[PDB]
Design a protein around this ligand. Structure first.
Ligand code: CLA
Ligand code: CLA
Ligand code: CLA
Ligand code: CLA
Ligand code: CLA
Ligand code: CLA
Ligand code: CLA
Ligand code: CLA
Ligand code: CLA
Ligand SMILES: CC1=C(/C=C/C(C)=C/C=C/C(C)=C/C=C/C=C(C)/C=C/C=C(C)/C=C/C2=C(C)CCCC2(C)C)C(C)(C)CCC1
Ligand code: SF4
Lengths: 37, 144, 118, 119, 80, 732
């Protein structure tokens, strides 16, 4: 019970290619530009 | 000698307007205002680029950083034998006089100045960087 | 002093800049966003259709170009939102810029959908 | 929410570290309750934008049923994408007589309430 | 701010003071040298770290030293 | 001000874009954070080490999973001579149908990459036969990675943070790491070899189902407890053994044969078992040396205080070195990097020549890729060893604790050291370049019989001492009437002699005047890189141009234009200048390796022996000739499977060239350009409604050197990787 299905690159490659870089760069940008109290 | 005051209603030198003047730093953070009194009408060189005519009497320019006012001070002091003073102005309106902060120019000794940042030893008499490891920050051995 | 040029100090230039929707000073940030989005999505739908990778297949070039235009409008709205989250901590406020970014999202998707409905 | 747990329909569960988040929890819960009712009872642009804009420009049982329905909708999507059957068919195969992840996840989860106590 | 230090090998030649483009240094009364003058750095918050003072100092080794430190808007020489 | 970075408020009060880069760059330099003590230093380093372990095991589990799902391992093991090893499948929606057809090679459904990492050979030799086995291994190593990441998080917790005494305990750590981490791990790998990897090569499956009911030897443990240990060497594998099957097999589990298995052209599993067993016993015995809490044992400070010679020829000797190795992490890190870099060179040099894995050295692209991969890794690690040694001199070195010892006396004769390194570098450079230019003038003027061809008689003497009967010296292993020959002749020499007298492998290749000239160029590169690195380490405290260099730290830009100007005066900048010589030197050794092996693999070693003696022969017959199918990877007639390597070849040339921009042009030009950009943005209407939060400035001097060296190095690596993989795979 190990083999991931036949549709798996079509989701996982654009996920870590586009969605997680967008979320990660937005999150790191908001963390960089945050003011200290 | 007493600390002089900035007159904002001082006429400026004759100048057609450069692209190298003030920016949003003058509106948000600070800008500096230089003031001198001339003996005659005479052309000088603007530190931001270009030529300008100083008036006969009180003059007034405003610059972004401090080195621009030092460059114009050195020019007006070594070329025209003038005595300028430039201030620090904030968008609040707070006006901070300096140079000459004692009233006497810093290139000659004046009684009353307190010596700051004077290590009373040679540079070879500093400690090793092992002796200043694990303080609250990066330190150089010449700081102590 | 500042340099004088017809380009920076013309009255027709001043009236045109005061009439563009980023300047009116009294209209809502939602309205500014939807007008700017209706402009920019409608112009952005074009080159994806005409030069995209599916440009030579009939009936699907316009669909793929408008879909990529909608994706780029979504990316731009995310950029506006994170710019507001970084910059502000009526248009130049946190709530106002969030309203403006949501208006840009809505107006940009409407502009792409109207550039298709063509 | 566990025996011995401490705080940082609230129960003190915040492992990742507010009012916008509470409102988002309430609206994800409401739409998930409507979606779970629709999936159990299973077997336009500008007006929606105006209603959403009016909603944006504007009590324990609601978020209790909301969290239960969010877990239910995750259940529908998960055991539909894995089993390939509907909820009634998966329930019928469950009754009357990803596995490593489920087992690993449960044990790991338990190791987890234990670990917090340790630290 | 940059760390500017003056050491007791100073001979009060005033060369560093007339080399600084920022008015950071000044001459104070002293008794350690024949000139009865010593340099001092009371305004290191405006120091950019150009090291014209170090270039101007005649002593071997230097009597003025500039240790580049944490940057601000004044020490980076920004006009914007 | 701003929050990032949390470890430095001096950087957090920076209003520019310098803050982001310097927060990225000073993040893992824990000795210079705010409020850092020594216990906190060691604890965060311990947690980071756990993080490194978790990333390595996740990397290995990912390699296993992607092979097990998208490769052809079970099909490769049936005929590993004619089938190419698949790395992972390709999903690129930017492709076209010719590219999908081109990267769909076989036997695969869609587009694949063909692996050049040797993992199929390694996994097949250690006993993998099926995909499920690789799935179980991937799940196991992912669970191990999760355990190490959790253990880093756990040992950060305040009920689990170790004290400073636990980190500064050297005798316990050497006893546990020698006896357990080396010895017991090597013993357990011997157990894996004997129990699994040898019967899998005999054709018998020994998995977890039956490893308790299958005998490793037909008399188990009775020779081991009788002392009759030679009963495990009886009946070895025959010289007609088909690997992985039962035809031509034996019963032995621990032989000592020498040379190679005849089919696979690789080391014997029984010899590797015996090898790991012997070194396991030696490391377990060596792990009982130092004094823990049991009375017996050696005391390292006592050993160091004792080894001071008479007559004061080393002064105080090794006095006070224990408190300077123990208290400094940069000394320990430099020692570790020097050892691991030399061992990585050892791995590459011994794995091309003595290939361990079945059907390695018939996969020529795997041979070239693994050699070049560990040689460049070794070069970077050696440069880091010298870098952290210079950091040791600046930060950790106390001179009063070392008054008179070996470390102070090196600083005393640093000028003699740098002078004699300068001499050997100049000598090797003048005469190596002069001989190559001389032979080029001879080859240009049509007279090859005038060119200076010195014969490598010393290394040929050494090969004759090793048992190679080509050069006719005939002594010590090449003469049949020798004591060493006659004593080793009964047991391990008959395989070693056949393997060293075979001229169809990399075991002690035939050498000539080209090999002479290139080994001299290699010595030039080594001595020169050592010159820059030793000069940067020993002039790190200061020089006559700057006596107080220790007061500025390790990586400062310069000391200004005074005193004639002082550019690249820092020890970091000496490292920076030496990375170029590292890349040059490894480029020389891998050009040499690759061209001598391409001429071995094609069949005409005469081509290398003739053209290797002149640099036009280099440029014509290696670089111009072997890049004919590379640059034809795509063309206006079509494309094929080498188009990714042609694109990556041009990609590396581009990154190299972009690095030259940061290397040549310096800061103030770009600062003036950015100031005009700031003016333009603040004056442009309807774009000055958008304003930066961080003030844009040009990159600093040190950052510029780092970014230029980074682009330079990445382009260097990608260009030679694309050329080597594409030439070897396209022509074989
Ligand atoms: C860590 C080593 C590693 C590397 C370099 C790769 C590389 C790849 N994977 Mg694989 N993956 C791995 C481990 C790895 N994998 C493991 C151990 C599993 C089993 C859980 C998978 C399950 C998997 C699937 C189902 C698929 C891929 C696919 C791919 C390809 C496309 C990238 C992608 O979207 O994957 C996504 C990556 C994952 C799903 C696993 C990552 C999970 C770990 C815990 C994340 C680690 C993050 C890392 C430490 C830091 C990165 C973030 C940081 C830089 C900010 C690429 C060749 C796709 C493919 O085959 O294309 C043809 C694809 O469909 N991977
Ligand atoms: C690594 C991740 C990644 C992935 C999976 C893709 C995938 C794609 N790119 Mg590529 N691209 C990438 C990175 C990636 N890109 C990068 C880093 C660059 C710069 C070097 C490019 C530069 C580039 C260009 C110039 C073009 C593409 C195009 C494409 C499309 C291929 C052409 C086609 O036949 O589709 C058919 C295309 C469609 C059916 C329409 C595409 C619209 C998508 C599906 C919208 C996605 C919806 C989503 C909500 C958008 C926001 C996502 C965001 C929140 C993360 C395909 C979707 C082409 C394209 O965009 O086609 C229009 C194209 O012209 N790419
Ligand atoms: C996407 C929907 C959603 C959103 C926006 C939230 C948001 C929140 N949850 Mg909720 N929660 C959710 C789904 C969601 N939850 C689901 C599906 C469950 C069942 C697993 C829970 C079970 C839960 C508990 C037990 C608690 C929270 C709590 C919280 C609050 C603090 C946690 C945090 O910010 O990190 C935050 C308002 C804490 C709280 O203060 O509740 C109001 C709290 O104690 N959540
Ligand atoms: C038009 C340009 C273009 C683009 C955008 C792509 C995109 C891709 N190629 Mg394709 N390809 C192209 C042209 C392109 N290709 C060309 C011209 C060729 C030669 C013919 C190929 C030949 C080719 C092959 C042989 C393969 C690909 C593969 C891929 C996919 C990699 C998936 C991935 O791992 O994403 C994530 C990207 C990475 C992991 C690499 C980026 C590394 C980062 C930037 C390092 C720095 C990290 C740093 C910390 C920043 C982190 C950011 C943080 C915020 C998260 C991706 C979709 C691979 C594939 O299909 O796998 C599924 C694959 O095997 N391509
Ligand atoms: C720094 C970057 C780097 C990278 C990316 C590589 C990459 C590689 N190395 Mg190289 N290597 C490197 C540096 C590097 N190396 C250095 C610095 C050295 C000198 C130390 C080596 C020495 C070396 C050797 C000798 C070999 C490789 C091999 C390889 C290849 C196989 C992948 C692998 O290593 O499996 C991942 C490995 C592991 C996850 C660990 C293996 C198991 C360890 C050794 C022992 C486990 C003990 C166990 C846990 C104890 C249980 C006890 C019991 C009682 C319970 C891969 C190309 C192999 C190869 O070339 O194959 C074709 C190979 O044989 N490397
Ligand atoms: C006997 C029990 C024991 C064991 C097994 C370990 C094991 C370890 N400790 Mg140690 N430790 C111990 C007792 C032990 N420790 C004690 C008693 C103390 C207190 C005195 C410590 C104090 C301590 C500290 C402070 C640290 C460690 C660390 C480590 C890790 C070293 C890094 C590493 O993984 O490389 C493994 C090394 C090898 C596998 C040997 C390499 C041999 C050569 C170079 C490679 C060539 C072999 C072979 C040819 C390669 C084949 C390649 C393959 C792909 C084919 C390792 C897991 C470090 C760590 O990482 O923490 C997380 C660390 O910082 N320990
Ligand atoms: C270090 C890792 C390791 C481990 C975990 C094992 C484990 C095992 N071996 Mg293996 N084996 C190993 C290394 C290892 N061996 C090595 C290095 C060799 C070559 C000498 C062998 C050659 C070998 C043979 C020929 C046989 C085994 C057998 C066995 C099994 C029973 C042993 C027994 O009953 O001992 C007796 C129990 C004791 C408590 C005495 C051992 C005490 C040790 C020596 C002192 C502490 C250390 C057990 C699974 C036997 C078997 O039946 O396999 C299925 C068997 O016939 N092994
Ligand atoms: C055992 C391994 C090891 C460990 C634990 C350390 C630890 C340390 N090193 Mg050392 N060092 C090592 C090996 C190690 N190093 C090696 C192998 C080298 C040679 C490269 C060095 C050379 C070196 C230098 C010159 C310096 C250090 C410094 C440091 C300290 C701070 C690290 C930091 O903050 O930089 C953060 C790390 C970065 C910002 C990395 C930037 C990325 C680099 C440039 C590579 C970019 C290539 C890119 C990834 C490729 C992408 C390709 C694309 C197509 C995808 C820390 C004590 C510094 C120090 O002590 O200051 C006083 C320092 O100046 N190290
Ligand atoms: C082909 C390019 C090239 C060459 C030939 C050299 C040569 C040298 N480098 Mg340099 N270097 C280079 C590129 C090069 N480097 C690059 C790209 C970098 C990165 C910045 C460096 C950084 C660097 C550092 C940090 C160091 C060197 C050092 C050296 C010298 C080492 C000792 C030696 O072998 O000298 C042998 C002499 C030669 C190779 C010069 C040839 C002499 C000619 C042929 C004699 C005159 C011929 C003819 C009459 C000329 C007439 C012309 C007429 C107009 C006058 C050597 C002169 C080291 C050094 O200077 O030690 C003393 C040193 O420490 N280099
Ligand atoms: C800077 C510095 C540093 C570093 C250093 C380094 C980096 C080094 C390296 C080093 C090295 C890297 C070395 C090497 C060595 C080697 C050797 C020493 C070898 C030897 C060998 C032998 C002896 C062998 C022999 C033999 C043969 C040849 C054959 C037969 C067999 C036999 C075995 C007999 C430190 C940290 C300390 C700190 C201080 C500073
Ligand atoms: S560095 Fe520039 S500013 Fe600082 S003292 Fe020397 S001259 Fe004056």
């Amino acid at each position: 019970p190990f083999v991931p299905p036949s549709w798996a690159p079509s989701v996982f490659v654009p996920l870590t290619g586009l969605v997680l870089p967008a979320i990660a760069m937005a999150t790191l940008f908001v963390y960089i530009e945050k003011e200290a109290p | 000698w007493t600390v002089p005051t900035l007159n904002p209603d001082t006429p400026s030198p004759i100048f057609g307007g450069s692209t190298g003047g003030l920016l949003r730093k003058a509106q948000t953070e600070e800008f500096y205002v230089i003031t001198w009194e001339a003996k005659k009408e005479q052309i000088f060189e603007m530190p931001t680029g270009g030529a300008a005519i100083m008036r006969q009497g009180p003059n007034l320019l405003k610059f972004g950083k401090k080195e621009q006012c030092l460059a114009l001070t050195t020019q007006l002091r070594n070329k025209f034998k003038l005595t300028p003073c430039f201030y620090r102005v904030f968008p609040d309106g707070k006006v901070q006089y300096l140079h000459p902060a004692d009233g006497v120019y810093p290139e000659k000794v004046n009684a009353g100045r307190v010596g700051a940042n004077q290590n009373m030893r040679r540079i070879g008499q500093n400690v090793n960087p092992i002796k200043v490891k694990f303080s609250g920050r990066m330190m150089s051995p010449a700081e102590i | 002093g500042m340099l004088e040029t017809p380009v920076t100090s013309a009255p027709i230039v001043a009236t045109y800049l005061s009439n563009l929707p980023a300047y009116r000073t009294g209209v809502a940030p939602v309205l500014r966003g939807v007008e700017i989005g209706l402009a920019h999505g409608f112009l952005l739908a074009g080159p994806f259709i005409k030069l995209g990778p599916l440009r030579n297949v009939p009936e699907t070039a316009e669909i793929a170009g408008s879909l990529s235009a909608a994706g780029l409008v979504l990316i731009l709205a995310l950029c506006l939102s994170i710019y507001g989250s970084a910059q502000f901590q009526p248009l130049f406020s946190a709530d106002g810029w969030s309203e403006f970014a949501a208006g840009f999202l809505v107006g940009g998707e409407a502009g792409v959908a109207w550039a298709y409905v063509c | 929410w566990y025996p011995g747990a401490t705080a940082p329909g609230d129960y003190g569960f915040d492992p990742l570290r507010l009012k916008w988040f509470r409102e988002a929890e309430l609206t994800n819960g409401r739409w998930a309750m409507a979606a779970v009712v629709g999936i159990l009872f299973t077997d336009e642009v500008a007006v929606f934008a105006v209603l959403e804009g009016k909603r944006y420009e504007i009590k324990l049982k609601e978020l209790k049923n909301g969290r239960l329905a969010m877990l239910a909708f995750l259940g529908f999507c998960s055991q539909a994408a894995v089993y390939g059957k509907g909820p009634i068919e998966t329930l019928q195969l469950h009754l009357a007589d990803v596995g490593p992840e489920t087992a690993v996840t449960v044990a790991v989860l338990c190791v987890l309430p234990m670990i917090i106590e340790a630290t | 701010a940059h760390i500017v230090k003056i050491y007791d090998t100073c001979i009060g030649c005033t060369q560093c003071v007339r080399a600084c483009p920022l008015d950071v240094l000044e001459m104070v009364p002293w008794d350690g040298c024949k000139a009865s003058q010593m340099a001092s750095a009371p305004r290191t918050e405006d120091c950019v770290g150009c090291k014209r003072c170090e270039t101007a100092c005649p002593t071997d080794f230097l009597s003025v030293r500039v240790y580049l430190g944490s940057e601000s808007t004044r020490s980076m020489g920004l006009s914007y | 001000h701003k929050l990032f970075p949390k470890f430095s408020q001096g950087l957090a009060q920076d209003p520019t874009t310098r803050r982001i880069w310097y927060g990225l760059a000073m993040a893992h330099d824990f000795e210079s954070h705010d409020g850092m003590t020594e216990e906190n230093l060691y604890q965060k380093i311990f947690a980071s080490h756990f993080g490194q372990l978790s990333i390595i095991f996740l990397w290995t589990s990912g390699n296993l999973f992607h092979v097990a799902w998208q490769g052809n391992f079970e099909q490769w093991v049936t005929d590993p001579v004619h089938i190419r090893p698949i790395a992972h499948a390709i999903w690129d929606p930017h492709f076209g149908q010719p590219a999908v057809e081109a990267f769909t090679r076989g036997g695969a459904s869609g587009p694949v990459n063909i692996s050049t990492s040797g993992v199929y050979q390694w996994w097949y030799t250690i006993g993998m036969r099926t995909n499920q086995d690789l799935y179980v291994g991937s799940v196991f190593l992912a669970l191990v990675s999760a355990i190490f990441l959790f253990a880093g998080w756990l040992h950060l917790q305040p009920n689990f943070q170790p004290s400073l005494s636990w980190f500064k305990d050297a005798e316990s750590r050497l006893n546990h790491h020698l006896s357990g981490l080396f010895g017991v791990s090597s013993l357990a790998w011997t157990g894996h070899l004997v129990h699994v990897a040898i019967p899998e090569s005999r054709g018998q499956h020994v998995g977890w189902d039956n490893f308790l009911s299958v005998l490793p030897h037909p008399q188990g443990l009775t020779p081991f407890f009788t002392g009759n240990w030679a009963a495990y060497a009886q009946s070895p594998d025959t010289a007609s053994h088909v690997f992985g099957t039962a035809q031509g097999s034996g019963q032995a589990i621990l032989t000592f044969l020498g040379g190679f298995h005849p089919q696979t052209q690789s080391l014997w599993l029984t010899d590797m078992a015996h090898h790991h067993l012997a070194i396991a016993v030696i490391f377990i015995v060596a792990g009982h040396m130092y004094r823990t809490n049991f009375g017996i044992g050696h005391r390292m400070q006592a050993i160091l205080e004792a080894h001071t010679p008479p007559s004061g020829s080393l002064g105080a000797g090794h006095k006070g070195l224990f408190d300077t190795v123990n208290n400094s992490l940069h000394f320990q890190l430099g020692l570790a990097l020097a050892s691991v870099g030399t061992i990585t060179s050892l791995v590459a040099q011994h794995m091309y020549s003595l290939p361990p894995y079945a059907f390695q050295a018939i996969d020529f692209t795997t041979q070239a890729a693994l050699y070049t991969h560990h040689q460049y890794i070794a070069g970077f690690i050696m440069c880091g060893a010298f870098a952290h040694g210079a950091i040791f001199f600046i930060r950790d070195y106390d001179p009063e604790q070392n008054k008179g010892n070996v470390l102070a006396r090196m600083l005393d004769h640093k000028e003699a050291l740098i002078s004699h390194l300068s001499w050997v570098s100049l000598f090797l450079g003048f005469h190596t370049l002069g001989l190559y230019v001389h032979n080029d003038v001879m080859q240009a003027f049509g007279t090859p019989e005038k060119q200076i061809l010195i014969e490598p008689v010393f290394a040929q003497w050494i090969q004759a001492a090793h048992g190679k009967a080509l050069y006719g010296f005939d002594f010590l292993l090449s003469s049949k009437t020798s004591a060493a020959f006659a004593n080793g002749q009964s047991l391990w020499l008959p395989g070693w002699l056949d393997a060293i007298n075979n001229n169809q492998n990399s075991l002690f290749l035939t050498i000539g005047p080209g090999d002479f000239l290139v080994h001299h160029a290699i010595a030039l590169g080594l001595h020169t890189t050592t010159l820059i690195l030793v000069k940067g380490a020993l002039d790190a405290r200061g020089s006559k141009l700057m006596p107080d260099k220790k007061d500025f730290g390790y990586s400062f830009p310069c000391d200004g234009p005074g005193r004639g100007g002082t550019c690249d005066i820092s020890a970091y900048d000496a490292f920076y200048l030496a990375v170029f010589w590292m890349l040059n030197t490894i480029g020389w050794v891998t050009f040499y390796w690759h061209w001598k092996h391409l001429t071995l693999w094609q069949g005409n070693v005469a081509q290398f022996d003739e053209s290797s003696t002149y640099l036009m022969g280099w440029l014509r017959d290696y670089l111009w000739l072997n890049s004919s199918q590379l640059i034809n990877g795509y063309n206006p007639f079509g494309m094929n499977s080498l188009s990714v390597w042609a694109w990556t070849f041009l990609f590396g040339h581009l990154i190299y060239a972009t690095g030259f921009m940061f290397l040549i042009s310096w800061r103030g030009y770009w600062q003036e350009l950015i100031e005009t950009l700031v003016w333009a943005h603040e004056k442009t209407p309807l774009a000055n409604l958008v304003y930066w939060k961080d003030k844009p400035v040009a990159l600093s001097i040190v950052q510029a050197r780092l970014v230029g060296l980074a682009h330079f190095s990445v382009g260097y690596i990608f260009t030679y990787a694309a050329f080597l993989i594409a030439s070897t795979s396209g022509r074989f």
